[PDB]
Design a protein around this ligand. Structure first.
Ligand SMILES: [Mg+2]
Ligand SMILES: [Mg+2]
Ligand SMILES: [Mg+2]
Ligand SMILES: [Mg+2]
Ligand SMILES: [Mg+2]
Ligand SMILES: [Mg+2]
Ligand SMILES: [Mg+2]
Ligand SMILES: [Mg+2]
Ligand SMILES: [Mg+2]
Ligand SMILES: [Mg+2]
Ligand SMILES: [Mg+2]
Ligand SMILES: [Mg+2]
Ligand SMILES: [Mg+2]
Ligand SMILES: [Mg+2]
Ligand SMILES: [Mg+2]
Ligand SMILES: [Mg+2]
Ligand SMILES: [Mg+2]
Ligand SMILES: [Mg+2]
Ligand SMILES: [Mg+2]
Ligand SMILES: [Mg+2]
Ligand SMILES: [Mg+2]
Ligand SMILES: [Mg+2]
Ligand SMILES: [Mg+2]
Ligand SMILES: [Mg+2]
Ligand SMILES: [Mg+2]
Ligand SMILES: [Mg+2]
Ligand SMILES: [Mg+2]
Ligand SMILES: [Mg+2]
Ligand SMILES: [Mg+2]
Ligand SMILES: [Mg+2]
Ligand SMILES: [Mg+2]
Ligand SMILES: [Mg+2]
Ligand SMILES: [Mg+2]
Ligand SMILES: [Mg+2]
Ligand SMILES: [Mg+2]
Ligand SMILES: [Mg+2]
Ligand SMILES: [Mg+2]
Ligand SMILES: [Mg+2]
Ligand SMILES: [Mg+2]
Ligand SMILES: [Mg+2]
Ligand SMILES: [Mg+2]
Ligand SMILES: [Mg+2]
Ligand SMILES: [Mg+2]
Ligand SMILES: [Mg+2]
Ligand SMILES: [Mg+2]
Ligand SMILES: [Mg+2]
Ligand SMILES: [Mg+2]
Ligand SMILES: [Mg+2]
Ligand SMILES: [Mg+2]
Ligand SMILES: [Mg+2]
Ligand SMILES: [Mg+2]
Ligand SMILES: [Mg+2]
Ligand SMILES: [Mg+2]
Ligand SMILES: [Mg+2]
Ligand SMILES: [Mg+2]
Ligand SMILES: [Mg+2]
Ligand SMILES: [Mg+2]
Ligand SMILES: [Mg+2]
Ligand SMILES: [Mg+2]
Ligand SMILES: [Mg+2]
Ligand SMILES: [Mg+2]
Ligand SMILES: [Mg+2]
Ligand SMILES: [Mg+2]
Ligand SMILES: [Mg+2]
Ligand SMILES: [Mg+2]
Ligand SMILES: [Mg+2]
Ligand SMILES: [Mg+2]
Ligand SMILES: [Mg+2]
Ligand SMILES: [Mg+2]
Ligand SMILES: [Mg+2]
Ligand SMILES: [Mg+2]
Ligand SMILES: [Mg+2]
Ligand SMILES: [Mg+2]
Ligand SMILES: [Mg+2]
Ligand SMILES: [Mg+2]
Ligand SMILES: [Mg+2]
Ligand SMILES: [Mg+2]
Ligand SMILES: [Mg+2]
Ligand SMILES: [Mg+2]
Ligand SMILES: [Mg+2]
Ligand SMILES: [Mg+2]
Ligand SMILES: [Mg+2]
Ligand SMILES: [Mg+2]
Ligand SMILES: [Mg+2]
Ligand SMILES: [Mg+2]
Ligand SMILES: [Mg+2]
Ligand SMILES: [Mg+2]
Ligand SMILES: [Mg+2]
Ligand SMILES: [Mg+2]
Ligand SMILES: [Mg+2]
Ligand SMILES: [Mg+2]
Ligand SMILES: [Mg+2]
Ligand SMILES: [Mg+2]
Ligand SMILES: [Mg+2]
Ligand SMILES: [Mg+2]
Ligand SMILES: [Mg+2]
Ligand SMILES: [Mg+2]
Ligand SMILES: [Mg+2]
Ligand SMILES: [Mg+2]
Ligand SMILES: [Mg+2]
Ligand SMILES: [Mg+2]
Ligand SMILES: [Mg+2]
Ligand SMILES: [Mg+2]
Ligand SMILES: [Mg+2]
Ligand SMILES: [Mg+2]
Ligand SMILES: [Mg+2]
Ligand SMILES: [Mg+2]
Ligand SMILES: [Mg+2]
Ligand SMILES: [Mg+2]
Ligand SMILES: [Mg+2]
Ligand SMILES: [Mg+2]
Ligand SMILES: [Mg+2]
Ligand SMILES: [Mg+2]
Ligand SMILES: [Mg+2]
Ligand SMILES: [Mg+2]
Ligand SMILES: [Mg+2]
Ligand SMILES: [Mg+2]
Ligand SMILES: [Mg+2]
Ligand SMILES: [Mg+2]
Ligand SMILES: [Mg+2]
Ligand SMILES: [Mg+2]
Ligand SMILES: [Mg+2]
Ligand SMILES: [Mg+2]
Ligand SMILES: [Mg+2]
Ligand SMILES: [Mg+2]
Ligand SMILES: [Mg+2]
Ligand SMILES: [Mg+2]
Ligand SMILES: [Mg+2]
Ligand SMILES: [Mg+2]
Ligand SMILES: [Mg+2]
Ligand SMILES: [Mg+2]
Ligand SMILES: [Mg+2]
Ligand SMILES: [Mg+2]
Ligand SMILES: [Mg+2]
Ligand SMILES: [Mg+2]
Ligand SMILES: [Mg+2]
Ligand SMILES: [Mg+2]
Ligand SMILES: [Mg+2]
Ligand SMILES: [Mg+2]
Ligand SMILES: [Mg+2]
Ligand SMILES: [Mg+2]
Ligand SMILES: [Mg+2]
Ligand SMILES: [Mg+2]
Ligand SMILES: [Mg+2]
Ligand SMILES: [Mg+2]
Ligand SMILES: [Mg+2]
Ligand SMILES: [Mg+2]
Ligand SMILES: [Mg+2]
Ligand SMILES: [Mg+2]
Ligand SMILES: [Mg+2]
Ligand SMILES: [Mg+2]
Ligand SMILES: [Mg+2]
Ligand SMILES: [Mg+2]
Ligand SMILES: [Mg+2]
Ligand SMILES: [Mg+2]
Ligand SMILES: [Mg+2]
Ligand SMILES: [Mg+2]
Ligand SMILES: [Mg+2]
Ligand SMILES: [Mg+2]
Ligand SMILES: [Mg+2]
Ligand SMILES: [Mg+2]
Ligand SMILES: [Mg+2]
Ligand SMILES: [Mg+2]
Length: 247
RNA sequence: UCUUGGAUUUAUUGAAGACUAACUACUGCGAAAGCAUUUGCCAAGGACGUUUUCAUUAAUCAAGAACGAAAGUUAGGGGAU
RNA sequence: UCUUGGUGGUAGUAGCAAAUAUUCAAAUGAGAACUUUGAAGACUGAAGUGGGGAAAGGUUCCACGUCAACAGCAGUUGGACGUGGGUUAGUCGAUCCUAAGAGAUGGGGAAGCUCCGUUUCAAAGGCCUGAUUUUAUGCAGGCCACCAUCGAAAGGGAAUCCGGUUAAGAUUCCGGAACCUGGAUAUGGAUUCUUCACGGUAACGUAACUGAAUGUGGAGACGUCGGCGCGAGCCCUGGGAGGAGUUAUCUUUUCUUCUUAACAGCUUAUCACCCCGGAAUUGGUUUAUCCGGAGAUGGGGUCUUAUGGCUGGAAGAGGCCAGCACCUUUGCUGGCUCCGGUGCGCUUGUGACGGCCCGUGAAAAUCCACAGGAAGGAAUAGUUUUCAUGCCAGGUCGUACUGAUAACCGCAGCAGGUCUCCAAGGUGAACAGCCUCUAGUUGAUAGAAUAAUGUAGAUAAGGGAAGUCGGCAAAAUAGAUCCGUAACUUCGGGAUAAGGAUUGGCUCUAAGGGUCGGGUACGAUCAACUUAGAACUGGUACGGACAAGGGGAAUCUGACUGUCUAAUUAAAACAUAGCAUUGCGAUGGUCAGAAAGUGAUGUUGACGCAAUGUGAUUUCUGCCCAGUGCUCUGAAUGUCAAAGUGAAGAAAUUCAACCAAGCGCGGGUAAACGGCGGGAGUAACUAUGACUCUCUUAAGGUAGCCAAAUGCCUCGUCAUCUAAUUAGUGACGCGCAUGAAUGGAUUAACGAGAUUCCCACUGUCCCUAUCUACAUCUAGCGAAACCACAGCCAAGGGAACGGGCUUGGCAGAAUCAGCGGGGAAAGAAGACCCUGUUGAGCUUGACUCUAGUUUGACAUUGUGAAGAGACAUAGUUUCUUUACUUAUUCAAUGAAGCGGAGCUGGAAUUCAUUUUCCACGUUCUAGCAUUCAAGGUCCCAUUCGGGGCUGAUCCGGGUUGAAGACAUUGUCAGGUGGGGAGUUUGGCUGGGGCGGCACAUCUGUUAAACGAUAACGCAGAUGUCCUAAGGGGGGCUCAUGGAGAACAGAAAUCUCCAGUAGAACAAAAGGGUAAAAGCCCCCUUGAUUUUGAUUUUCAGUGUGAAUACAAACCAUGAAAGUGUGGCCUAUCGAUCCUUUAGUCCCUCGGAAUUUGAGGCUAGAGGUGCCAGAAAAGUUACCACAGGGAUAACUGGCUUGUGGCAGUCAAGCGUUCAUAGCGACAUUGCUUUUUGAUUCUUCGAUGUCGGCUCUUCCUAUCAUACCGAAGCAGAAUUCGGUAAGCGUUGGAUUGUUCACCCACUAAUAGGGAACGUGAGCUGGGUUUAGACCGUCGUGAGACAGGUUAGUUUUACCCUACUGAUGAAUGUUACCGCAAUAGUAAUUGAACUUAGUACGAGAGGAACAGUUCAUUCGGAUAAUUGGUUUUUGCGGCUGUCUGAUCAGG
């Protein structure tokens, strides 16, 4: 009869993300006239490390088109992007790794990253390290582009949505064992409080639906309805199937 | 098993992965395992030709090594048949 | 267990015993263990008992006075009491900045208190003018797109040091010497006739050397570890100049002073850079291996100033001395304060590097620089107050003291707790331990004595775990050097494996450095601690104190490191990496919030977030989709609500069709929950069963593993381990009840985990003893628990265990030290068990709901179409989709470039027309891009400048995109919803639970001849059945037997005789019944209506059932009569509500009519727990009220059962009942078995076993004396008197019990609250933690297995053991002995004697002597043990200068 650990996560007190050492939000440049009609040249100044993020972050300086000053945009660095490299962003930009282009102005089978779902949301898709979006189709009439997502999902998005050529740098990061609890400790120390995880079968019945009993066991099906309520969704929620991928 | 929620079949436009038919032979190349679409680059090789050059530098080889179909193993990718 | 207050006994008692320790004198004082001073002795031993601070405290600081209380003794003293005094800042902090975060406003939400939100969807804003007289400077232009505020006395940050000074303040006061900020402001220098400096190739330099808007950059501003290098301070050390110590002796000796701050000038560096140069024969180079044609080495330079040097500060200060003054005011005068060295030293700062990360290790205020070029200034002068000097100011608050064995929190002056800085010498690896210096303390109630029992520390012959649940506790080992080092292994380890040597002192030796250099065959000099070797030496000692691993062989278990139940469980539990599954592509997943223009993940995006399971590596993860869950564009006339539609109705309304999701149907899914069988026949063995068959399955337990922490039986069987093993290990496996990510098997390493064995080692034990330090007595001080009254027993009875009562024993003041038998001692209204119509935690398919979610409808909600959209010259909305935007919604931005038209070029082949299109100034490069923009063109009224226009196309003022009448939101409707809420979870009962129903009933009996009568008494029965099995009438007689008839018999039909019921009557059993109540036939509905009376249950209520009538109407028979269900005794049901029948009756209250409703009378629908709630579990996490009305353990009664006896004598005993036995029977005893009971205790009598220790019984095992024998001897067997005296050591098990190895004279049985826990122990059981197996959906259960789990108090009374003692004239000595206690026990050998006896085989006893066992009482000559004799000697470290002598 006690509020369980996943229900306490939404109150956001000790389960907030640890955001002191992060460099800022990584976004694309704002979709302005220069990117909508031509291109703009920025410069990679630093490739830095973002805390909690597996991917390195490029700091790219553009000239402000309407005032005399410099705008520093924070990009997710694509693999091969180097300091001092010019980055071109706009409809008329070229097919180079690091360049920011609308997806309608881009051929088929092109690998892109930091892809807007809607034109002007400044980067939504394929942002984690090593991830990319394949362009798998164009529907020029009532402009739409079919893309393939890193989960394998096909998705039709707008041709005016912008992506960045290349894959996200930092790939292969989950290819290393952590080997030890301290490396997971320092990994999650700058993400958020979600580790270590006590199992619900190891708790009392007051703490979890899986809690209690004279042996640690579940006792009802771990598969939970989508139409179940908070406190009940502790297991394999709305599972179409279970078990190993074996035919 | 699929099928009036139109299967199978027909047309058009795609995507993906493998494979490289027919030509293909008592034909070729490679130390062998092997190697068959095109083009480019890169290093190599046999045979022939030579009134070039060096002049026994060679033959086979315990130990030692490189390569070694398929299946299989480990970890990613890919996953059409 | 009343409330408040007061007071006792206990009681002058328990105690005032941790932190090594005090002592002598004098002074003061009434009074000194405790105050002060001297002296001595000690300690903290620089991670301090020292010197300061942070929090907290708040005057405790300091002085004077003073002791009533407080300082658990004292007090003259005090952190006490009384009275005062004391905290000084431009520089130290706060103040300021931001951090995680807090929070106004605008705005939205909320009935509201208030919530959200923090730049959001706001008309959110104040700053310089280039420097002056129409200016309190503004009524001039011009710029900034930022957005409250709070938030750190440890982060960031402007600037102060030294010396002196108080009773108490100081980086704050004084003296000297600085520095910073803000302001004003001149002078000197610099700069200008080339207006805004000059030099250097350059890196860069300098005393300056204009510089607005705007932009850019830097600093602020950053992890951790390692070695290296440098600096500071400390340490060590040499010379010299002073002072003190020692000086029988030695010691150019031992100690001590010898200092230089902030700030300032000049210099000084790793790194970095620049110039020249052009490198392979590759060079330079770090402890660490990096660097060089992207220019090395080398040769010149430049720079930062960490840091150091010199100087100023500044010797005048500070220190050490000397001499003279010696109530001198109070000093005066003089001297010296100097020169080195050393280093893996210690601490700290710092540099350049290296390593680590799926971790890459704050922000802001603030300050500076650069870019730019607005603007302004060159001749008796302007600019810079970034050069120097000069002038003024710097507020407010804090500031004392402690920072703890006495200033803080813990009830207190409490052995607890509470953050940090500094940091001497030696030993030594060391910030260990030990000793010492500076500094600090010597505080803690004392004195005397040295009993028991303690606590703390020890030692121990011989044995060496025999102790115990268990090696618990202790001992053993230990540093370093050298040697040696197994299995196994994840190849990293294991590992200090195991084991073995050496070690002191002294005197030497050999190695290992730094400075030192060359001709256009050569060594002075300086310093250090490491290693190796050798001789000599000694009571063979030597890591000499201190400090300091026990090891090995295995098993179970969890990989490891880690975390955890604060205050009983540190684990095998949790976590972990690894593995796997699930959801989710954002108008989304998961989760918040009452709502919201609201949130967490999210400064996020599938290599991610979220939910789970399993738990490293290795190896594997089998089969099952029936169940349940989950899921699926899955089937769309199965079910279906609200709205809506249709019919009928006067209408309310009723009926009908349609009817979304969900459920139903079908599919998928087990690393979802889970589950994974029996029997028979079979091989040329007997069982065994590759195979086969049906029985049900969804599949039938696979690979593996196993009496496992999982196996009941079970201590399973075999082997091994031992003398002996319920232990361990290895096997075996029809496995109560093993098994595969509810993970199976393995596994190196690891473990304060559990277990077995072995070596070492030991007081664990045999078997105890001794020693040291800290109860007793005293002076002082002085509680508490508890207490009906009290305190000697035995027996009886008694609420079945008395201190009191009864009958006996008896019994003499006052006591002290012990002690644990009793006070069913104390501590707590029993946590176990039960009850209560008392709860709570938790679960679920309980009952009833509910947040949320999902689906529909209506509203928001407008504008068009197509319209297989309505009902056959016929319709804007109607069972399908897409068009519009302006509502709504989402999103972004400094609301910047949207939409539509506008020059050319052409692969439009200008078809004389943009039916018609595309391109809108930027892609080698880490530069730069700003001043309403230069240009061009026009006007000013011209003023050294200004204004237009174009450059830069017009027009629409839709910021831009998405989405769209769908989302959203509101209301209602259906579904889902242990997420959450509330509640329930009957009773009786030889305790409760399970079972049963003895809960409403009927027959017989129990039941004791009226009636009534109990038990979970006995044997049974009821919840029905019947249109006849009811009613009436009539005829007949049944069961059974005998005697006869073709098939035909024991049984088929027919005939006769007998037949009192032996048959039948629906169903139990009892009663009843013969021209019937049975059987068969005929006619029927009296099984009807009305409403009373009565009987039985009983209260003389109800209900059920029955009796007899009365009023009718009927049936039947000729009739009398009978019939108001069943031949009689059982066969059943309130109120409320619904429904039907009856009158056509009452009411709808302003009057009606008609529907509808309500009513009156009679039934039905149902309460079986049957006088009638609507109802699942669990609790070992538990709670409360109680209960001895009631279980678990003692006692009591009983004695089936257990144990022990007797009588009788069939029969056994070669013949022979009774030597010894003894069947079939039968009579007893006991209370050490287990039942039976529930009398005592539930405001608690401590629950198993062992250890220890005493006594008692006798039903006698041994020993003594005897009787009997199928007693020749020997050895046995039976029995008597007898409890005097003994009755053991071990292996396994927690055990009791058992079983085995031994030894013995024998290893008898019992009791004493199943003797004995304020005697212990805690292995077991029986709290809370954890694992397994089975069970359960689950929470959870299991007299199943396993592991871990706080054992309190005596000082009171008695009892006991010891010890005093008043009174008897006093005192003293010597005695007596009533009474009480009593103590010795058992064996062997020799001789008897190889004798008696015996055919032999074998083989005694008494007497005698010698010893021994167990017990007891002493004792210490000897032997051993003990050592504070601190007696003598030795040894380590340190200290007293050495020695001697010591601490
Ligand atoms: Mg809670
Ligand atoms: Mg809670
Ligand atoms: Mg969770
Ligand atoms: Mg956050
Ligand atoms: Mg986590
Ligand atoms: Mg995990
Ligand atoms: Mg987990
Ligand atoms: Mg638990
Ligand atoms: Mg739950
Ligand atoms: Mg559970
Ligand atoms: Mg588990
Ligand atoms: Mg579910
Ligand atoms: Mg071909
Ligand atoms: Mg793939
Ligand atoms: Mg009171
Ligand atoms: Mg009193
Ligand atoms: Mg007294
Ligand atoms: Mg004491
Ligand atoms: Mg004294
Ligand atoms: Mg003395
Ligand atoms: Mg000492
Ligand atoms: Mg006084
Ligand atoms: Mg006192
Ligand atoms: Mg005193
Ligand atoms: Mg005082
Ligand atoms: Mg300050
Ligand atoms: Mg602030
Ligand atoms: Mg509002
Ligand atoms: Mg405040
Ligand atoms: Mg501060
Ligand atoms: Mg900081
Ligand atoms: Mg600070
Ligand atoms: Mg500041
Ligand atoms: Mg001065
Ligand atoms: Mg100059
Ligand atoms: Mg700077
Ligand atoms: Mg580190
Ligand atoms: Mg390290
Ligand atoms: Mg200064
Ligand atoms: Mg200073
Ligand atoms: Mg500049
Ligand atoms: Mg002031
Ligand atoms: Mg003040
Ligand atoms: Mg002060
Ligand atoms: Mg205080
Ligand atoms: Mg206390
Ligand atoms: Mg204390
Ligand atoms: Mg205190
Ligand atoms: Mg000292
Ligand atoms: Mg004391
Ligand atoms: Mg001994
Ligand atoms: Mg031994
Ligand atoms: Mg043992
Ligand atoms: Mg123990
Ligand atoms: Mg060694
Ligand atoms: Mg060793
Ligand atoms: Mg070992
Ligand atoms: Mg040796
Ligand atoms: Mg020596
Ligand atoms: Mg185990
Ligand atoms: Mg562990
Ligand atoms: Mg606790
Ligand atoms: Mg533990
Ligand atoms: Mg657990
Ligand atoms: Mg957030
Ligand atoms: Mg299934
Ligand atoms: Mg299925
Ligand atoms: Mg799983
Ligand atoms: Mg199973
Ligand atoms: Mg087994
Ligand atoms: Mg066993
Ligand atoms: Mg076992
Ligand atoms: Mg065997
Ligand atoms: Mg086995
Ligand atoms: Mg499985
Ligand atoms: Mg393994
Ligand atoms: Mg452990
Ligand atoms: Mg020994
Ligand atoms: Mg002993
Ligand atoms: Mg003794
Ligand atoms: Mg005493
Ligand atoms: Mg006394
Ligand atoms: Mg008193
Ligand atoms: Mg006291
Ligand atoms: Mg008391
Ligand atoms: Mg009395
Ligand atoms: Mg009695
Ligand atoms: Mg008595
Ligand atoms: Mg009494
Ligand atoms: Mg009496
Ligand atoms: Mg009497
Ligand atoms: Mg009497
Ligand atoms: Mg008598
Ligand atoms: Mg007596
Ligand atoms: Mg006395
Ligand atoms: Mg006494
Ligand atoms: Mg005692
Ligand atoms: Mg007692
Ligand atoms: Mg009570
Ligand atoms: Mg009670
Ligand atoms: Mg009840
Ligand atoms: Mg009751
Ligand atoms: Mg509770
Ligand atoms: Mg509407
Ligand atoms: Mg509108
Ligand atoms: Mg816009
Ligand atoms: Mg709508
Ligand atoms: Mg609503
Ligand atoms: Mg629920
Ligand atoms: Mg509930
Ligand atoms: Mg019972
Ligand atoms: Mg009864
Ligand atoms: Mg009678
Ligand atoms: Mg009876
Ligand atoms: Mg009865
Ligand atoms: Mg009945
Ligand atoms: Mg019947
Ligand atoms: Mg009645
Ligand atoms: Mg009555
Ligand atoms: Mg009845
Ligand atoms: Mg009847
Ligand atoms: Mg009748
Ligand atoms: Mg009848
Ligand atoms: Mg009622
Ligand atoms: Mg009326
Ligand atoms: Mg009327
Ligand atoms: Mg009516
Ligand atoms: Mg009605
Ligand atoms: Mg009636
Ligand atoms: Mg009824
Ligand atoms: Mg009743
Ligand atoms: Mg209670
Ligand atoms: Mg009773
Ligand atoms: Mg009995
Ligand atoms: Mg008995
Ligand atoms: Mg008996
Ligand atoms: Mg007898
Ligand atoms: Mg005879
Ligand atoms: Mg009581
Ligand atoms: Mg007692
Ligand atoms: Mg006898
Ligand atoms: Mg004898
Ligand atoms: Mg005896
Ligand atoms: Mg034993
Ligand atoms: Mg027993
Ligand atoms: Mg014997
Ligand atoms: Mg007895
Ligand atoms: Mg007894
Ligand atoms: Mg007992
Ligand atoms: Mg006892
Ligand atoms: Mg007792
Ligand atoms: Mg005890
Ligand atoms: Mg006991
Ligand atoms: Mg125990
Ligand atoms: Mg617990
Ligand atoms: Mg299980
Ligand atoms: Mg245990
Ligand atoms: Mg424990
Ligand atoms: Mg006890
Ligand atoms: Mg006593
Ligand atoms: Mg004895
Ligand atoms: Mg004697
Ligand atoms: Mg001794």
């Amino acid at each position: 009869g006690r509020v369980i650990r996943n229900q306490r996560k939404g109150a956001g007190s000790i389960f907030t993300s640890h955001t002191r050492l992060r460099q800022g939000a990584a976004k694309l440049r704002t979709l302005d006239y220069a990117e909508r009609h031509g291109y703009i040249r920025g410069i990679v100044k630093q490739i830095v490390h973002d805390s909690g993020r597996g991917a390195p972050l490029a700091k790219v300086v553009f000239r402000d088109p309407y005032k005399y000053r410099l705008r520093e945009e924070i990009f997710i660095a694509n693999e091969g992007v180097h300091t001092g490299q010019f980055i071109y962003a706009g409809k008329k930009a070229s097919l180079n790794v690091g360049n920011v282009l609308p997806l309608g102005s881009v051929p088929e089978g092109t690998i892109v990253s930091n892809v807007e779902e809607k034109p002007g949301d400044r980067g939504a898709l394929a942002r984690a390290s090593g991830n990319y979006v394949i362009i798998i189709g164009h529907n020029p009439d009532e402009n739409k582009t079919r893309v393939r997502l890193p989960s394998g999902a096909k998705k039709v998005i707008s041709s005016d949505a912008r992506g960045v050529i290349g894959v996200i740098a930092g790939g292969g990061r989950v290819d290393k064992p952590l080997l030890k609890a301290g490396r997971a400790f320092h990994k999650y120390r700058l993400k958020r409080n979600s580790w270590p995880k006590t199992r619900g079968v190891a708790m009392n019945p007051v703490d979890h639906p899986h809690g209690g009993g004279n042996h640690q066991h579940i006792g009802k099906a771990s598969t939970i309805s989508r139409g179940a309520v908070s406190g009940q969704k502790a297991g394999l929620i709305a599972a179409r199937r279970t078990g190993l991928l074996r035919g």
